[PDB]
Design a protein around this ligand. Structure first.
Ligand code: HXG
Ligand code: HXG
Ligand code: HXG
Ligand code: HXG
Ligand code: HXG
Ligand code: HXG
Ligand code: HXG
Ligand code: HXG
Ligand code: HXG
Ligand code: HXG
Ligand code: D12
Ligand code: D12
Ligand code: D10
Ligand code: D10
Ligand code: D10
Ligand code: D10
Ligand code: D10
Ligand code: D10
Ligand code: CU
Ligand code: CU
Ligand code: CU
Lengths: 241, 233, 244, 244, 241, 244
């Protein structure tokens, strides 16, 4: 009917980018003016409220996304038609595109924004505005999206339904293993290494699990294997050459 | 002699040499010359160079062309590492002895543990004579006198060379008894048991027993000689 | 009809759209992993101009930056023969870094761009990609390619940092322009003692600090290039495990 | 005619010549690898007689010397059943070291041989080879053979270094003959503080320093012997890869 | 015609040994008398000239040897006769014998000669006479010989022509990785460690690639596999026993 | 007849007896390995009540204790589906430690039990085992299970060490009861400087030392849990090698 739909990907991209742009404007306005001092009540009013509303909301969102994708799964996935299988592969690629955008927003934008924020304050607490935005919003958001991408493939595409793709597992967990370094950082940023030396091996736990973001290589390679198999002998050599 | 390549500010802000003198410019083999001077430790010791808390006085020369018989710093005989306090001045003197004929540039040098070498003034020393005429000599606690130029080398040779010969003989014995290609083919053809199997193991055990006996005999014999030795100071 | 597509035009359009989606999907999150790794290992040397010294910076940054370039080269070249993997990773890193420098370091915290600009890596990445392209082997591009990856770091970065090595006199004491910028625009948790820069040493035989660092960084890089090429190969696995 | 040789005599002559060529070919470059490794890991302890202390030297040298002995044993025994592998490596190392001491340390720089003589390893190598020969398993010779490799180091080196441990009195201070030799023949870049020798310690219980060190090197060798036996197995691979 | 020729091996051994003996005599004569101070013009006359001549000469020699061996290759390497394959294997063994001699000269003789030179001078520069002889002559020489040895097998023997022998690659590259810490020792000798301690981790990268000299084990084993396969059923048992 | 057993009852009795024997056989020697590892890595933190601080103890102990729990979980769950592997390891460690504390630390050396009692681990082990039971995958219990393993360490140990954190005044100086017990009952080789406890830092923010340490220790454990699950899988190998 229409293999390339793309409406879902556009909706997700617009929603995510607009939400992150709103968050960036909010923290531009309130980084100072009740953002610096962590003991003032205005900090609780403007920043701790976000922290308290983040974890339950994203936890519920991820669990509900997994449950919805599991209850919406087809029980005859082996009988999918080549056209429907290609459509599902395209939807998986859309999921992965949204996932990559979320990964850029969290692991790249806000993570290095923490770098410039650490040069503005003297670390009044662990729950700085940058920490609230980065550790407790963006990282959970992209891990939730990875869960959605992982569970869509598990429940729609027969190749990912008959087992667990190791690369998909890595790209779903290891990037979710970047938020974990909240302890490795805070405990590291108190006992062992003694300054905002980002180079310190208190942050090398961040790095090792940051390498797992490369697991998308195997995921897209499996997707391409499926695509190249779905197109018949006519598709590969007559058209694609 | 390589002090030119060292960084300028480190050279001028670590050690300030003065009153450096060389007793003789031309020396003969087995003739003693004294290199003495005073050194000032800069108060603003650079962060790059570690503290002079652990340092060693040395004579900067191209190898042992001059044998150091004794050296003093801070009114102390200093064959080992010494401590230099920042901001203090110390007097040093090195008793050298001509060994190799030629014209050599001999420096005064102090090495800091975490910094490296600091090279002081250097003077050209002309050495006349022949190398084979060189004798130290030194006296032992028992009163006997030995020549450090040649002492102990004969024993080291007599212990090392025979063992190297024994190892070579072992290798050649096993190489001629069983060929390399022959034994490789034999092992690859499943039969890696007729390549090595008693009486071969008997020869091996005889060699091991003889080696252990020689080691024990050698250890005991070299304990009769030099019955009183001390660890490195 | 060309299954599973209705017509040839539909197949071509689908292929083009999926190509664009795959390109974006890889470029992002390769940017993500590479930016995380570079941020938390390579410093904090890319953050501050007063950290871009002659010894540590051209040593640390190329060695730690060649990693995802090698991984992306392993992914692209082995599976697509596309010779832009190292350029892919370097462009992603530079795009993310420049965006956040302008938006967060300068846009948010009002740190001048002259203080927080990153280090250029496009030239070494192009060298690496072409060496892999002219050759066909990662072994060759590991050695000659990554050796040039280090030797090209300082020369391609000098045009951007030369203006900040101009000497100025402050209260009877010589300081560089970069030192002055770092000292003027106050950073709270960044003292001078932490800078981890070339502070001198009794055996630095002058006029060759940068060449020595470049050869060290570039020629150590082949160990890192090998390790990360094979790590990218492992990350490209299609293995499906039966249970978790 | 025995293919691909014309006659039996030609085949035998070819086999003998190639056997000699292979023996030289391996002995050299096993010498090379072993000498590089020992020189840059095991010191600088073999270099100087005043470095051959009672604790660090008999610990460091056997542990880092058993490596190529185990690797060469793995090569020779598994593929040829020839029981000279550890003796092979040790003899190569000692021949190279002695040649370089006599030609360069003494022939070039005129350091007396009493200062620069190396440490004997032939006896522990023979012990290791025979233990591998009487047994048939590398597991046994890893435990008992390499245990004797450590315990036999000092006793077999005592005949060559005891003469230099005689006490002498220098300016009201006790010094060994080895210390005097190191102090007399000046080395530029070799201060006393770097010697990394036994300088005393508050929980050494006298008259057992050498037995404690020798045993310590005895079983740390077993771990190193195991690892390097398997590394020699890996280096003996015949794997051919399709693309590099 | 003649399986064992050995003229090439004898010529190579004689040439290499005579050249290295000449170099040793030259550095005996000129180690002092313009070999100590690196800033004197006589050092440029007697030592820097060698450095400037070395690198282009050995680069040209290695590239030309590889090109000659590649252009002289047979295009029907499979149709080699057993006797000609024995001759080629013997020539390869001659190549590897010369390679082992060169490795001894470089990795063992001059590498530890640098050890005794370090106790004679205070390291006026990185381009000491010992460094010139060791780093820039002997290491490139034996890597060039390895390249010739590696390319001869690739271009004359079908077993090494159908792919890349992993052990041969190691024995050709890893010992060619015995030069790298000229950057790394010097940077180590100028930044990390302070004194001329050969036990420095700055010399440990020298070691990890010095282990690659053990790659000759696999090369010799493959050569022996080829030899044992070529000798017929009568050769293995009836003759060799 | 049910071969190789004569009758049904004989087979049942044999199976029951062998089940008991296997249970004892594993419980011991898992106690052995776990106790050696925990004693020689995790201290010396279980040994002394004055070592059980708020930062180092709840960090070191859970991380090094999750090891054998994960390995035994890998053994039991994969091969038997029995959900007590972590409880198996923890109970073994606790039983051995308590036996040694009472019989030797108190029975032999007369150190009071209040000084030498170990840290509780049954609650985190139960949490880990149940999480592995409700789930069926080691990946989930690696993350959620081992996260609760560390976060539960301090709360389940607080009832035991709270009484020793009561403040006391000694010669015009504040001391804890744990410090007093460590000070009153003299230990020869335990100076105060060795204690390796939370001594404060300029970036400790008030009232969150324990939550930070528990999150660090507990959430790192997934790396250790993964590594040791797979190491227990490797130790569960049935491979038979042809030669040694
Ligand atoms: C955070 C934005 C993620 C956007 C990812 C994307 O492009 O795919 C979204 C996908 C695109 O649509 P598709 O999976 O093709 O069809 C959606 C309808 N179901 C789930 C019945 C197949 O729709 C969904 O949101 C999946 C269901 C979860 C929300 C209730
Ligand atoms: C291994 C058989 C040959 C040596 C037998 C012997 O009497 O030596 C043991 C003795 C044991 O040391 P000890 O007598 O306690 O102290 C002697 C110390 N030195 C050798 C420096 C005088 O010397 C050693 O230190 C050699 C290393 C241990 C081999 C078992
Ligand atoms: C560490 C070895 C790297 C070079 C690979 C090799 O062993 O060379 C043989 C190889 C044989 O592979 P080939 O059939 O040429 O297929 C590879 C195709 N290219 C050349 C485009 C990579 O050709 C090359 O890649 C380089 C030849 C240079 C000689 C001066
Ligand atoms: C790599 C080709 C482009 C650069 C060529 C050039 O003239 O630069 C070499 C020169 C060599 O350093 P030198 O002239 O000894 O000292 C100049 C040091 N700076 C650049 C800090 C003034 O500058 C560098 O330090 C760049 C890194 C080495 C590339 C081979
Ligand atoms: C010049 C060395 C080439 C080694 C090629 C090879 O077969 O790889 C070795 C091994 C086996 O590779 P395999 O899985 O068989 O895949 C061979 C095909 N490539 C080379 C494209 C991955 O892979 C690794 O684990 C890498 C070890 C070094 C970096 C830590
Ligand atoms: C007595 C312990 C034997 C351990 C070796 C083994 O069983 O094989 C496992 C693995 C795979 O070997 P595989 O491919 O099965 O080849 C068998 C031949 N050996 C026994 C020489 C490895 O071997 C290794 O790579 C060495 C591991 C221990 C040192 C770190
Ligand atoms: C580095 C010395 C190696 C000595 C060992 C050996 O047998 O190899 C020498 C090789 C033995 O001859 P081979 O390679 O078997 O080739 C014989 C037939 N031709 C000369 C026509 C290729 O002869 C050459 O010197 C060939 C020319 C190389 C420089 C461009
Ligand atoms: C890092 C992934 C961990 C979860 C495994 C997974 O990919 O989920 C699919 C899997 C499919 O395996 P299944 O057929 O359910 O068999 C495993 C049986 N249990 C659930 C008892 C472990 O179901 C689960 O174990 C968890 C599902 C939770 C969704 C909200
Ligand atoms: C895990 C459920 C049982 C404990 C619930 C509780 O109230 O404890 C949390 C509280 C959090 O610490 P806080 O009240 O900030 O400081 C109390 C510090 N102590 C216990 C040393 C007085 O105590 C802890 O330190 C236990 C470790 C964290 C478990 C989530
Ligand atoms: C979320 C990661 C799942 C990894 C599952 C897997 O296939 O195991 C990885 C690797 C490859 O699997 P393989 O050896 O083929 O054996 C598959 C069977 N299990 C899963 C029990 C190892 O096995 C290991 O040796 C463990 C490495 C990590 C700990 C240091
Ligand atoms: C495709 C690139 C091939 C590189 C071949 C290198 C041949 C050896 C050169 C040795 C120079 C010293
Ligand atoms: C048996 C294992 C149950 C695992 C439940 C998975 C829930 C996924 C939530 C994702 C939140 C980011
Ligand atoms: C390592 C290079 C440092 C500069 C030394 C002087 C010029 C060298 C010419 C090759
Ligand atoms: C981060 C890399 C870990 C290894 C990836 C999976 C390896 C698959 C082996 C076939
Ligand atoms: C076995 C007899 C021990 C003799 C006294 C102690 C010597 C040190 C051995 C470790
Ligand atoms: C230096 C040793 C590296 C590994 C050698 C190759 C291993 C082959 C595995 C079959
Ligand atoms: C989530 C509420 C945090 C309360 C104050 C900070 C305590 C330390 C937690 C890391
Ligand atoms: C201590 C664990 C070492 C590895 C166990 C054996 C691995 C078997 C691989 C199949
Ligand atoms: Cu932060
Ligand atoms: Cu001079
Ligand atoms: Cu050197």
């Amino acid at each position: 009917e229409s293999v390339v739909d793309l409406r879902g990907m556009w909706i997700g991209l617009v929603l995510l980018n607009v939400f992150y742009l709103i968050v960036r404007i909010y923290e531009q306005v309130f980084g100072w003016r009740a953002g610096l001092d962590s003991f003032a009540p205005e900090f609780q009013t403007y920043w701790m409220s976000i922290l308290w509303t983040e974890i339950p909301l994203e936890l519920v969102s991820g669990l509900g996304l997994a449950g919805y994708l599991w209850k919406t799964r087809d029980r005859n996935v082996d009988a999918v038609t080549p056209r429907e299988e290609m459509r599902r592969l395209v939807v998986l690629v859309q999921w992965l595109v949204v996932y990559g955008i979320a990964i850029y927003w969290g692991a790249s934008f806000f993570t290095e924004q923490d770098g410039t924020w650490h040069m503005t304050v003297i670390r009044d607490t662990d729950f700085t505005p940058s920490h609230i935005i980065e550790f407790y919003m963006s990282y959970p958001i992209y891990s939730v999206i990875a869960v959605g991408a992982f569970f869509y493939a598990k429940t729609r595409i027969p190749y990912f339904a008959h087992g667990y793709s190791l690369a998909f597992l890595i790209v779903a967990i290891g990037p979710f293993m970047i938020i974990p370094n909240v302890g490795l950082n805070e405990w590291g940023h108190t006992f062992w290494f003694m300054e905002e030396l980002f180079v310190a091996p208190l942050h090398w736990g961040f790095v090792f699990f940051g390498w797992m973001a490369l697991g998308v290589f195997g995921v897209v390679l499996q997707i391409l294997m499926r695509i190249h198999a779905l197109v018949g002998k006519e598709g590969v050599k007559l058209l694609t050459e | 002699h390589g002090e030119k390549s060292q960084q300028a500010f480190l050279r001028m802000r670590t050690l300030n040499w003065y009153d450096v003198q060389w007793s003789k410019t031309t020396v003969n083999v087995n003739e003693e010359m004294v290199l003495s001077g005073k050194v000032h430790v800069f108060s603003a010791w650079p962060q790059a160079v570690a503290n002079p808390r652990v340092s060693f006085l040395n004579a900067g020369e191209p190898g042992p062309v001059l044998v150091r018989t004794a050296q003093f710093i801070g009114e102390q005989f200093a064959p080992r590492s010494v401590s230099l306090e920042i901001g203090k001045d110390y007097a040093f003197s090195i008793n050298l002895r001509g060994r190799r004929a030629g014209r050599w540039h001999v420096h005064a040098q102090i090495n800091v543990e975490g910094g490296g070498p600091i090279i002081g003034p250097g003077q050209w020393i002309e050495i006349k004579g022949d190398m084979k005429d060189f004798t130290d000599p030194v006296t032992l606690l028992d009163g006997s006198t030995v020549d450090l130029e040649h002492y102990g080398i004969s024993r080291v040779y007599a212990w090392h060379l025979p063992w190297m010969a024994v190892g070579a003989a072992w290798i050649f014995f096993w190489f001629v008894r069983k060929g390399i290609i022959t034994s490789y083919i034999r092992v690859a053809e499943g039969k890696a048991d007729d390549v090595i199997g008693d009486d071969d193991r008997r020869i091996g055990a005889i060699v091991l027993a003889l080696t252990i006996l020689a080691t024990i005999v050698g250890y005991a014999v070299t304990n009769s000689t030099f019955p009183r030795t001390i660890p490195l100071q | 009809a060309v299954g599973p597509f209705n017509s040839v035009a539909e197949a071509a359009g689908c292929v083009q759209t999926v190509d664009w989606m795959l390109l974006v999907l890889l470029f992002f999150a390769v940017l993500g992993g590479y930016h995380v790794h570079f941020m938390l290992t390579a410093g904090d040397w890319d953050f501050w101009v007063d950290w871009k010294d002659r010894r540590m910076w051209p040593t640390v940054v190329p060695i730690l930056g060649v990693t995802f370039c090698a991984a992306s080269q392993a992914f692209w070249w082995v599976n697509f023969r596309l010779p832009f993997g190292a350029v892919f990773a370097a462009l992603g890193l530079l795009i993310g870094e420049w965006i956040n420098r302008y938006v967060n370091f300068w846009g948010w915290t009002y740190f001048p761009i002259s203080l927080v600009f990153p280090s250029a890596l496009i030239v070494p990445a192009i060298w690496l990609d072409v060496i892999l392209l002219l050759s066909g082997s990662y072994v060759i591009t590991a050695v000659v390619g990554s050796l040039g990856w280090g030797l090209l770091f300082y020369p391609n970065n000098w045009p951007a940092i030369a203006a900040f090595h101009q000497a100025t006199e402050q209260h009877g004491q010589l300081m560089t322009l970069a030192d002055l910028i770092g000292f003027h625009f106050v950073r709270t948790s960044m003292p001078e003692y932490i800078r981890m820069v070339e502070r001198g040493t009794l055996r630095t035989f002058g006029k060759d600090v940068v060449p020595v660092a470049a050869f060290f960084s570039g020629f150590v890089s082949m160990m890192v290039y090998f390790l990360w090429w094979f790590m990218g190969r492992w990350y490209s696995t299609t293995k499906v495990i039966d249970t978790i």
